[PDB]
Design a protein around this ligand. Structure first.
Ligand SMILES: O=C(O)CCCC[C@@H]1SC[C@@H]2NC(=O)N[C@@H]21
Lengths: 168, 353, 176, 176
């Protein structure tokens, strides 16, 4: 049932459940109590119902600084992918405040490159949903280097494909 | 008919050659010559007859039973292609119904429990395409890899796949050349390429490494990395070592890289990993040597012979339930179809010959 | 000041040499009201835009967003150098250990500021250097400051035939 | 071997100098099985593709498809030279007179091989030279072999400013 094709389908239903609920069930309750929505609930209300195609849903960090490798949430504290708004293509990231306060790290930076580079490639808008405490301090300079590679591909895009930031 | 002498190097340049059993022959040098040169005695049919070009040489694409067929195959080939490399391949757009059929579901099974049991990749293809229609090229040549055309939403798409049934789906000089110059064709015409991945590696032997695998296996890597046109990959089962890279990996520029739960994506097979890792923990106490080693094998295969590492580090966009594949490839090649990507200025590349 | 100068010397094909010694952005409620956020962006946008050879040398302090600004490799600077006295970190030790110790400092206020001054020394000793940035190839080399004039020469010699462009556009949309 | 070398020196703008002495393709059932037809094409495809100055000199033997391969004028070679001892023909005399005599040889086997050896001499005397190719301007000149180093110099001097391109394409589709 694991060594068996069926078992390995019923594994990837388990890790889909764990991935979509990365953030703990007090952290989500705290977010609601602050009148905020959760990053997924944001993505739905943007994109045309059913379009979503989530990329790097099973991403995980690779930092073992300051015992940050005690937990490696799937997604690494951002929800990224592609779909349609009003039946027109558009690539989206939604930072997850539930996960590590939503602090940016290396992986959860390199996801918001992958989306960018997919927009630039295809020629489609990027709608960036923002909700983060700041830099993931555990990952030191790493989580600066991620910011930089975003801020290079915000400039490269600039005037080419519309970039809209939704600060929440 | 006959195509003899230098002539043959016209049809060679040309994208696709169609040849009709028992009544069409190609040869640079006639049997007469090669007798009184090389003392060898050979008929026309064997020398260069349809079958012999289709299966052996890797020169022809198709061998039709009769002319009428052959003409029909040629009209089929045109169907998939644009008139010239400034237009995109003729479409009859349909919008596909992406609720999970009972065809779809069948995918969720058709990878057997035993790694070794084979299963026809021709299915996994025909699952995804329009009307389950696959128009295969070069069937008789390098069966261990499958190339051809169909449609997704009424739009042409090119298909490259490893075919477990043959050689286990291992890549070999012949499959790497057959696939390489299919991809390049699809790319130059702007037709998209969909790649299905089962591959345990490259089929060992001394021959292979004399003939020049090194150069002639490279071909396929070059073709993928060169390609602009939409590239969607799906790993069903096995993806080891370089032969993972080769098969339309992300590292070469493939847009969207899916992997089924069954996928195994790892430097090398677990016995031939456990070896090199544990060669001083399997040396200690020759007593119960194997008992450990086939332990450390059965931990390797449970730890690393799965999609999930290559997921964590975004080498495969998504691990997906095999049912879902004809949704992903749909709503992938929607986005893609405005892919815009190019390779540095240059009169031509320098791909290995 | 620096944004418009970088642009100028990237429009008229003049190589830019940076030198880096920046603790961070000036803290004030004026700076924020008067749009730092838009008007500090300009510098990042100039760096990333520019396609004439960029060579950066961090002399001393390079923390957080300011490190990124100052002709960092992330924004497509060619050759990034650092002296031994470069400190390249998310943010000052004090601020760092306030967030990544907060607990074991709140523990036993008996010796709070104390254990926290120790922790500040530790974090400075561990990460207040160019040796993690080095490891990850954010700075090409760590150099002996005397060797800053050689690297700049040899680097520009190579760099002159740099070919680099930004995707087709009528113009960018930089912060105003 | 030769295809990939020609490409290399046509990608990096290096002129190619050919020398031609080729009876034809190796006859075997291996060569054909192992895809001569695709893998001999590569050379023709490299020649015709290449847009850096091409200068060819036929020293001796140049028959059939092999003549075409070897940097012939048909595949867009600039300046084609031939020495007096160049033989440029569809195919060896013997093979030629076997097909374009077949009758008057089958006549009277009394002196078959004989009249056929004579015919072989004739056809060699008539067409086994560079004088029909000359007539039709397939080879610019017939030269005295000593004058092969002058023509190559003077020819390259001119040829250097050669401008030539192939129709717009992402890439070709050469035989693999
Ligand atoms: O079926 C046959 O006739 C024999 C097989 C090969 C025939 C050779 S190919 C060149 C030559 N031209 C022809 O029309 N027949 C022979």
């Amino acid at each position: 049932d694991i060594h068996t094709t069926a078992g390995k389908l019923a594994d990837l239903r388990r890790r889909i459940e764990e991935a979509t609920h990365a953030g703990s069930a007090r952290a989500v309750e705290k977010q609601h109590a602050k009148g905020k929505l959760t990053a997924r609930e944001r993505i739905d209300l943007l994109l045309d119902e059913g379009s979503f195609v989530e990329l790097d849903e099973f991403a995980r960090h690779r930092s073992t600084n300051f015992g940050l490798d005690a937990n490696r949430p799937y997604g690494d504290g951002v929800v990224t992918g592609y779909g349609t708004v009003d039946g027109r293509p558009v690539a989206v990231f939604s930072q997850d405040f539930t996960v590590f306060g939503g602090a940016l790290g290396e992986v959860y930076g390199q996801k918001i490159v992958k989306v960018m580079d997919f927009a630039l490639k295809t020629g489609c808008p990027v709608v960036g949903i923002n909700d983060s405490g700041g830099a993931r301090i555990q990952e030191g300079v790493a989580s600066l280097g991620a910011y930089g590679e975003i801020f290079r591909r915000n400039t490269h895009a600039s005037g080419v494909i519309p970039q809209i930031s939704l600060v929440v | 008919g006959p195509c003899a002498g230098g002539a043959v190097y016209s049809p060679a340049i040309t994208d696709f050659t169609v040849m009709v059993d028992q009544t069409s022959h190609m040869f640079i040098t006639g049997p007469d010559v090669i007798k009184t040169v090389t003392g060898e005695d050979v008929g026309f049919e064997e020398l260069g007859g349809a079958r012999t070009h289709n299966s052996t040489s890797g020169v022809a694409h198709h061998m039709a039973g009769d002319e009428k067929d052959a003409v029909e195959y040629v009209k089929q080939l045109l169907s998939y292609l644009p008139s010239n490399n400034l237009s995109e391949p003729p479409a009859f757009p349909e919008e596909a119904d992406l609720a999970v059929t009972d065809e779809d579901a069948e995918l969720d099974t058709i990878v057997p429990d035993s790694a070794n049991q084979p299963y026809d990749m021709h299915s996994v293809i025909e699952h995804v395409l329009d009307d389950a229609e696959f128009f295969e090229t070069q069937p008789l040549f390098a069966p261990n890899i499958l190339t051809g055309f169909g449609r997704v939403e009424g739009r042409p798409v090119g298909i490259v796949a490893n075919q477990p049934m043959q050689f286990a789906g291992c890549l070999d000089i012949t499959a790497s050349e057959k696939a390489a110059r299919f991809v390049r064709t699809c790319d130059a015409f702007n037709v998209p390429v969909l790649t299905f991945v089962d591959v345990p590696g490259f089929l060992p032997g001394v021959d292979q490494e004399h003939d020049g695998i090194i150069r002639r296996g490279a071909k396929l890597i070059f073709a993928y990395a060169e390609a602009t046109v939409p590239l969607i990959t799906v790993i069903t089962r096995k993806a080891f070592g370089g032969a993972y890279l080769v098969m339309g990996s992300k590292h070469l520029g493939a847009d969207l890289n899916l992997a089924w739960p069954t996928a195994q994506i790892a430097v090398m097979g677990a016995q031939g990993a456990v070896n090199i890792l544990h060669r001083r923990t399997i040396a200690d106490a020759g007593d119960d040597a194997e008992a450990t080693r086939a332990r450390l094998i059965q931990e390797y295969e449970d730890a690393l012979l799965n999609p999930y590492t290559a997921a964590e580090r975004g080498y495969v966009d998504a691990v997906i339930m095999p049912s879902d594949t004809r949704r992903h490839i749909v709503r992938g090649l929607r986005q893609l179809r405005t892919k815009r990507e190019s390779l540095p200025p240059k009169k031509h590349g320098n791909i290995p010959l």
